[PDB]
Amino acid sequence: AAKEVVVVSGVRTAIGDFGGSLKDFSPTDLGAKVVSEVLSRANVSGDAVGHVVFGHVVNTEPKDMYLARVAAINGGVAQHTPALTVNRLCGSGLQAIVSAAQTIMLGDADVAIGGGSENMSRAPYTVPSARFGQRMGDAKLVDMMLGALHDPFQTIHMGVTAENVARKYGITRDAQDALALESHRRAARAIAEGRFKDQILPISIRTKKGEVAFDTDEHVRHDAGPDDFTKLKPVFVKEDGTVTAGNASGINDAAAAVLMMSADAARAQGVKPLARLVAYAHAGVDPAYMGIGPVPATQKALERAGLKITDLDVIEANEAFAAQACAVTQELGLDPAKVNPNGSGISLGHPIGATGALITVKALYELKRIGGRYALVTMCIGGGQGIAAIFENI
Amino acid sequence: AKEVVVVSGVRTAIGDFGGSLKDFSPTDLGAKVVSEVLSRANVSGDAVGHVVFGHVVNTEPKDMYLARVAAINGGVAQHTPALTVNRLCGSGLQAIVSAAQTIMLGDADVAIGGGSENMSRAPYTVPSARFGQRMGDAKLVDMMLGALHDPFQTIHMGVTAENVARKYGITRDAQDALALESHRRAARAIAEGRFKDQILPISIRTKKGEVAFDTDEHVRHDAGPDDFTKLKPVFVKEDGTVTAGNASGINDAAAAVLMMSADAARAQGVKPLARLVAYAHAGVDPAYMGIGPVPATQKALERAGLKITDLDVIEANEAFAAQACAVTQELGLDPAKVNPNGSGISLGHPIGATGALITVKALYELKRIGGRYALVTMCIGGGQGIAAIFENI
Amino acid sequence: AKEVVVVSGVRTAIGDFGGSLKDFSPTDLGAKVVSEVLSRANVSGDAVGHVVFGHVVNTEPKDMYLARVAAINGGVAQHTPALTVNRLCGSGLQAIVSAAQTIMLGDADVAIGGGSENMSRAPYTVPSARFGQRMGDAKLVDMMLGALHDPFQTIHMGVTAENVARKYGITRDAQDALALESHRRAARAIAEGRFKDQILPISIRTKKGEVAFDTDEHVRHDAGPDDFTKLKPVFVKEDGTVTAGNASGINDAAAAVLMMSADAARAQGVKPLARLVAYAHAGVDPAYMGIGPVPATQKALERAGLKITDLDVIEANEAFAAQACAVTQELGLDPAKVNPNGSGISLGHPIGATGALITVKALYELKRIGGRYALVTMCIGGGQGIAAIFENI
Amino acid sequence: AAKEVVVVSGVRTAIGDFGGSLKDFSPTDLGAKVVSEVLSRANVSGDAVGHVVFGHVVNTEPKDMYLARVAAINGGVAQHTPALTVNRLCGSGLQAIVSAAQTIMLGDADVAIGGGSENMSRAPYTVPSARFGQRMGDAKLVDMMLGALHDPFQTIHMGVTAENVARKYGITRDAQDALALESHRRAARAIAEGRFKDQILPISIRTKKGEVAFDTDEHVRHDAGPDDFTKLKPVFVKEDGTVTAGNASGINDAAAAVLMMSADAARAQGVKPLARLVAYAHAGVDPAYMGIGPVPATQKALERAGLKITDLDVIEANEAFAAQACAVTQELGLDPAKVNPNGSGISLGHPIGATGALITVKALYELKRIGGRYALVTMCIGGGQGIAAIFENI
């Protein structure tokens, strides 16, 4: 049978705004930082890692095509360890964990690191005409960030797909604004109570005034009220819009990782782990309704775990758009009080490829905060997919 | 872990840098090979549990969706998950392994694994363009050349080939000898038609009319040893051995295989190419990445319960003659069974697709000669190797 | 106002877009023509009072220094002031006028006037690159095409040529007739050697060895009317008449003349080409810029006390057959005396240099036929014309 | 003989910082604004202009290759008026005035506008490899602003040539800092007393808070003291430097213009003019010592006017670098109290192609402020030139 997967350690950076506090840190720099820190939290030597897998979507420089391997080596993992970079768009961070968990389940590794890293502030422009020349007439610099945020089949912003989902599932503007506000208030409470302190790795940021520690998610508005979201205008369609800058996730910079071991290695070393992996599942949907991807993915994951919605103490379902996040909670019958209890993409940000690893970290630490048992991690995926994993606190 | 059978496979002909496939984006070539493998396996696009594609150099925004776009435009139903993987030069074989893992773990009964790369379309980036340069000249960065540079010492992959030539005693004469033979085996394979059945022709729009591109165009059909000894090194100024002639090209191509669980293949009455026996991965010193195949192959043979002499076909990519000679030498392989129809030096190296493409070759060679076991392995920039073993059936 | 004599002049052969002079920067070509005119006039580079050069499209930072770089690297002493002027297609003749003005006003006894342009090397700009684009695709702007667009209506200069064809009754047949004849006159001039003495050969580095570039390469030597009537318009989709064949090319070239006060020329025993009789400028509707030469020429003939029938040589640049036919028609000129050896359609239009270059032609034609008065005029994008009249001596 | 040239009107914009308040106004936009305003100040119809000449160095867009003609037409000058753009680097603004004055002197025009316009914030990057392609390996985006500030013969920054001049002419660091400080204090006094109000055309600048008037030279430090310049480090050479960011001119955005007429047209219309043109002169020098160009140019201009240094009531000599400006004043024997009495490039900025027209405006208004008679306008020129003009208040 398949080997049990234990998540022994996890960490994330705080999440930086677009053009904000992490804009000078490359995706391989952020990835190496979380690799070194998960190894130290698990008390695992860099020479004892079987596989490294990292999620990552937008290459900012040539090194990023080597991302998992540079993150591993500069993170202190020995050169004999294989390293893989995976891209399942917004779900890459969680995919990387599943992919790393699969090496353990199949007996190819006893230890594996799964992470993600993304720096959207550093997303590049391309010039397709530069290699062979344009010859005459104007050409373009192609924004690879906005490009990654366009559905490749209809060439519409992810935001338009969020409007498709609000329309189809009856998610009003007032519902989306209520979810957005509540996410900022939960995140601001979590910061004030220190709920994130143990799971965040501070980053010292070179400033002209001397070094200061970046250890707080800066996208969060701490003074928010209803009118900050009411006054805003829809941004992605000209007619009958509901999706705004305020009730859509940010675009952001972050990295996160977890370190996992077979259950037998974990036993024999005597680790005090975060959780075990119970099940995962994938799904594809209509690309024009990609925001509801978590629904079938979550259903299939719960079937594989032998669990029901009501057994979930903690749910991290990324708020890519309040339009889709509301529809996900509505179609699955979730309790909004248990979904994203400390905020999510709208308030903390959406550092694409890192997001799915980061919110796994969030779910596992929240399980420990409340003494819960089971957590669901799930996210929608551009191009029309969903991914879900269930973890058990142990 | 369930048994994985490879029922069908296909590849495009390999295009030269700036050549016949320069106008075909990577998702276009990926969609073509997807649609064709579905039809060769006679499998509904509604019956696929997972698509995984390897791809290294994003040429446009759509490429960040490559597997998904390849699957949808190739006729796979929207309900199928789709994943893009990057293990540099091994990405193509990785995608096959990753897709086979979904079947081994019972997450899918049917899976497609493939690779697609168009280096001709590799872009230049401008890292200062979003927030501005402000003052001073800025860089336009070659993402193709950057993909071919080791990220630790910022040296060309070719310098790591010189390192491997030093450490393992691969002379310049030894390299050009392999390079020449690779081209003769390829030209010989093209002439006997060995590649016909595995290649999907692509119609390439010319002013002269419609013309079908179905032949690997990197091959020198008139090659003699003199064409190689006259060239001189290009990666180290003095005391060098790797040249443009004994190193692979960089190229444009796509390939894919369709796989099923053993049960599903039986129930569908499909006559399969091969079965997956084992795979393994290895990490090595990045300065010596070209030797990656040796420990990968050793670990895979261990898991498969085989030895080197049980291998009837070996596709060990020729990234550089300097590396491939050393791989053969260290593993004790029979050069007659290693790349019997050429490899990267003669046929090309369309990186993210190569591992899938040479898997296709290896399976079709097994059928040509009636062999049993085939090894597929390659070196990986950054310092890895990947290897897989297949059994004809 | 003192008398201005043109003692010497020279030009390069005109290169095609992407052709023989594509590797010669504008300051390089400018320095060449400076050094040569000094030596043809036998004037020390220490004796020059002013250098003025016309130039429109900056190809690199040095071009913002063009006149100064051309003068210094051409051997003019550093104590000579140097000015770059831009009156678009008239810049070359403007530089001559501006340099002649320093002599007329007694600010200098010796002055060089010239033009230099390399359109092949015209750059692309990135206006968002300094402070960044932030979000959304950005533009790479073609500065060559932008130079050829009217800045008021953002239409190609060719559309203004269609406007001129409408208003003045210039048929498509009339245009191709001028275009064909321009090419035959040029090929005929090249064959008799009319251009030999005025052209400075430039050695152009080829893999085949050293080869001398001394012949205007835009000329079709085998031209018949059929090569023009088969092409069809390119600047308005329907109801058009201007084509690639009856419009000038865009080209790379440099030219210059050296001038002196009458007294200084006498004292130096130099045998001059001609004297400056008069000049004038005109502004017109930008949508009809191609008719600019007509009022300029009329005003210049007034100041010179001459009429159209006193002109033995006319160099009226052929920007578009549609415009040049109308200029000849409105002024009542004899087509036999207008561009007797071709002009922009056959020879090319290296814009900032053209006005200087066709001044050179006009003066050398006066010597060839023993004529007295020559008119030099051209149209100017944005809606101007410039004209100058010279007297052989 | 040559016809007398009367300067009837003049105007300038305030001078914007690099990336500052004028960064969104193109050079043809600024040029049209000053064209329309000089015409209105002279009470001259746009249909009665004989020639327009504008100085301009760095093309920011295709329209700039038509700069004088777009400035003229969009400024309200009739389309029958010829328009010329001139480039004599830093001296282009004054050259444009001389060139326009020459059309009057030679009887080709009775009215002529001479101006300059530059927007360095909008100076572009080029990509020489874009038209025909780079094929392989990295390429460059070429900074055309920094390129314009490099000597084309040795490829050294103008700042290094300023160090050549300080060395050769014995201009110490303390002298350069004293000149720099004094320029900011004079400029700040001029702003507080309103000395610039009549000569500046306000520009309404679209801001999110509503329209605000840009009418004050923003480069000026109003709170400066000696230590702001002492603390700074040399910027252009590694050894034995004296030239700093603080004692070098800024790079800037501005436009200016004057309108001139033959003396007979001015008489017959009855204008109340600023000044008459007395003489101008040019000079070239060693490109490596370009900063002393104003010395021989000023000497030759004074010879042509039949005047002496001591007849000059007002001197506008552009402070490109305190190193060169000090040497110019020292070699000509000028009184520093009469040179740049209200500041210059170091404190107000150096909007290259506009600078020479702008400081003509400054000199003519200062003549009126003090009832002086003769003003010298002079500037150094990259590549090694100088230009000078003398005006008489009438």
Q: Where are the domains positioned within chain D? A: 5-123+250-393
DSSP-derived pairing of the beta strands B15-16 and B82-86: unpaired
DSSP string, A320-356: SBHHHHHHHHHHHT--TTTBSBTB-HHHH---HHHHH
Closest listed residue to residue B388, CA positions, set B160, B27, B113: B113
**Nearest chain C Cα distance for residue B236, angstroms:** 25
Could you identify the residue written with the tokens 């073993």? B389
Annotated catalytic residue: which of B50, B55, B89, B325?
B89
Tokens encoding C170: 């210039």
- Residue B178 CB partners (closer than 8 Å, separation 6+): B246, B318, B321, B324, B325, B345
**How many CA within 13 A on the CB side of residue B139?**
10
To the nearest 10°, report the CA torsion of C185, C188, C193, C197.
10
Closest listed residue to residue D90, CA positions, set D391, D348, D379: D379
Within chain B, where are the H helices?
26-41, 66-73, 91-104, 143-147, 157-168, 172-192, 226-229, 262-268, 293-304, 321-331, 344-347, 351-369
Tokens encoding B370: 């009636």
- Residue A118 CB partners (closer than 8 Å, separation 6+): A27, A56, A57, A58, A252, A253, A254, A255, A351, A352, A353, A354, A355
* SS3 label, residue D259: strand
Q: Check CB contact under 8 Å for A69 and B384.
A: yes
On the 0-12 / 13-18 / 19+ scale of CB atoms within 10 A, C184 is middle
Technique that determined the structure: X-ray
CA dist., res. B60 & res. B66, Å (int): 10
Residue of chain C nearest D20, judged by CA positions? C131
CA dist., res. D15 & res. D219, Å (int): 8
Question: Contact at 8 Å (CB) between D43 and D102?
Answer: no
Question: Contact at 8 Å (CB) between A57 and A118?
Answer: yes
CA dist., res. C202 & res. D205, Å (int): 52
CA dist., res. C299 & res. C318, Å (int): 20
CA dist., res. D94 & res. D84, Å (int): 14
CA dist., res. A177 & res. B252, Å (int): 48
Q: Check CB contact under 8 Å for C72 and D126.
A: no
Question: Contact at 8 Å (CB) between A104 and A110?
Answer: yes
Question: D5-123+250-393 architecture in CATH?
Answer: 3-Layer(aba) Sandwich (3.40)
CA dist., res. B7 & res. C205, Å (int): 59
Tokens encoding B259: 């796989």
Tokens encoding A216: 């707080």
Using the CB atoms, write b or e for C282-307: b if 16+ within 10 Å: bbbbbbbbbbbbbbbbbbbbeebebe
Question: Contact at 8 Å (CB) between A51 and A112?
Answer: yes
**C180: Cα separation from own chain's centroid:** 20
Question: C4-122+250-388 architecture in CATH?
Answer: 3-Layer(aba) Sandwich (3.40)
CA dist., res. B21 & res. B121, Å (int): 10
Using the CB atoms, write b or e for A27-40: b if 16+ within 10 Å: bbbbbbbbbbbbbe
CA dist., res. C195 & res. C182, Å (int): 15
**How many CA within 13 A on the CB side of residue A293?**
38
Tokens encoding A36: 């070194």
Closest listed residue to residue A388, CA positions, set A307, A268, A269: A307
On the 0-12 / 13-18 / 19+ scale of CB atoms within 10 A, C80 is buried
Under DSSP, the state recorded for B270 is: -
- Residue D125 CB partners (closer than 8 Å, separation 6+): B133, B138, C125, C126, C129, C130, D141, D142, D143, D144
Instruction: Please name every residue paired with B29 in a beta bridge, in sequence order, or none if there are none.
Output: none
- Residue D11 CB partners (closer than 8 Å, separation 6+): D34, D37, D38, D41, D199, D200, D201, D256, D257, D258, D361
Could you identify the residue written with the tokens 């009887």? D107
Q: Estimate the share of chain D in helix, then strand, then coil, as percent rounded to the nearest 5.
A: 40, 25, 35
Sign of torsion, CA C167 C168 C169 C174? negative
Under DSSP, the state recorded for B245 is: S
Within chain D, where are the H helices?
27-41, 67-74, 92-105, 144-148, 158-169, 173-193, 226-230, 263-269, 294-305, 322-332, 345-348, 352-370
On the 0-12 / 13-18 / 19+ scale of CB atoms within 10 A, B238 is exposed
Residue of chain B nearest C134, judged by CA positions? B130
- Residue B193 CB partners (closer than 8 Å, separation 6+): none
Using the CB atoms, write b or e for C190-221: b if 16+ within 10 Å: beeebbeebbbebebeeeeeeeebbebbbbbe
Question: Contact at 8 Å (CB) between C116 and C353?
Answer: yes
Measured CB to CB, residues of chain B less than 8 Å from chain D are: 124, 126, 128, 133, 135-142, 144-145
What is the count of residue pairs from A and B with beta carbons less than 8 Å apart?
A: 194
N-terminal to C-terminal alpha carbon distance within chain C: 19
Question: Contact at 8 Å (CB) between C265 and C41?
Answer: no
Phi-psi region of D213 (alpha: psi -120 to 50; beta: other; left: phi over 0): beta
H/E stretch holding A360 reads helix A352-370
- Residue C207 CB partners (closer than 8 Å, separation 6+): none
> Cβ–Cβ contacts within 10 Å for residue A296, how many?
20
Closest listed residue to residue D388, CA positions, set D330, D289, D301: D301
CA dist., res. C231 & res. C36, Å (int): 40
Tokens encoding A4: 């049990």
CA dist., res. C63 & res. C186, Å (int): 31
Closest listed residue to residue D275, CA positions, set D2, D3, D4, D58: D4
Residue type for position D44: V
Judge whether A350 counts as a catalytic residue: yes
CA dist., res. D173 & res. D243, Å (int): 7
Instruction: Please name every residue paired with B139 in a beta bridge, in sequence order, or none if there are none.
Output: D140
Sign of torsion, CA D28 D33 D36 D39? negative
Q: How many residues does chain B have?
A: 393
Give chains near A: 3+ CB pairs under 8 A. B, C, D
Taking each helix axis from N to C end, the angle separating A27-41 and A67-74, rounded to the nearest 10 degrees, works out to 50
Q: Check CB contact under 8 Å for D130 and A132.
A: no
Closest listed residue to residue D177, CA positions, set D219, D250, D233: D233
CA dist., res. C301 & res. D305, Å (int): 35
Tokens encoding A360: 């796994």
Q: Check CB contact under 8 Å for A130 and D129.
A: yes
Chain C positions in Cβ-Cβ contact with residue B130 (cut-off 8 Å): 132-134
> Cβ–Cβ contacts within 10 Å for residue B77, how many?
13
Under DSSP, the state recorded for D149 is: T
Q: Name the CA radius of gyration of chain A, rounded.
A: 20
Residue type for position C198: Q
- Find the angle CA(A131)-CA(A137)-CA(A143) to the nearest 5 degrees: 60
Chain C positions in Cβ-Cβ contact with residue B134 (cut-off 8 Å): 130-131
Tokens encoding C321: 């057959």
Sign of torsion, CA C4 C10 C16 C21? negative
H/E stretch holding C254 reads strand C251-261
Within B42-90, where are the H helices?
66-73
Residue of chain D nearest B147, judged by CA positions? D137
Chain A positions in Cβ-Cβ contact with residue D139 (cut-off 8 Å): 130
Question: Contact at 8 Å (CB) between A259 and A72?
Answer: no
Instruction: Please name every residue paired with D277 in a beta bridge, in sequence order, or none if there are none.
Output: D391
CA dist., res. C81 & res. D281, Å (int): 10
> Cβ–Cβ contacts within 10 Å for residue C247, how many?
27
Closest listed residue to residue B148, CA positions, set A30, A125, A71, D137: D137
Phi-psi region of A324 (alpha: psi -120 to 50; beta: other; left: phi over 0): alpha
Annotated catalytic residue: which of A51, A90, A282, A326?
A90
Question: Contact at 8 Å (CB) between D323 and D163?
Answer: yes
- Residue D133 CB partners (closer than 8 Å, separation 6+): A129, A130, A131, A132, A133
Tokens encoding C55: 């130039």
- Residue B281 CB partners (closer than 8 Å, separation 6+): A51, A82, A108, B296, B299, B384, B385, B386, B387
Question: Contact at 8 Å (CB) between B82 and B67?
Answer: yes
Chain A positions in Cβ-Cβ contact with residue D133 (cut-off 8 Å): 129-133
Closest listed residue to residue B346, CA positions, set B181, B182, B226, B173: B182
Question: B4-122+250-392 architecture in CATH?
Answer: 3-Layer(aba) Sandwich (3.40)
CA dist., res. C195 & res. B308, Å (int): 77
DSSP string, D266-331: HHHHT---SEEEEEEEEEE--GGGGGGTHHHHHHHHHHHHT--GGG-SEEEE--SBHHHHHHHHHH
CA dist., res. A391 & res. A374, Å (int): 6
Within chain C, where are the H helices?
26-41, 66-73, 91-104, 143-147, 157-168, 172-192, 226-229, 262-268, 293-304, 321-331, 344-347, 351-369
Question: Contact at 8 Å (CB) between A217 and A15?
Answer: yes
Chain B positions in Cβ-Cβ contact with residue D140 (cut-off 8 Å): 137-140
Could you identify the residue written with the tokens 């103008």? D158
* SS3 label, residue B121: helix
* SS3 label, residue A173: helix
Judge whether D326 counts as a catalytic residue: no
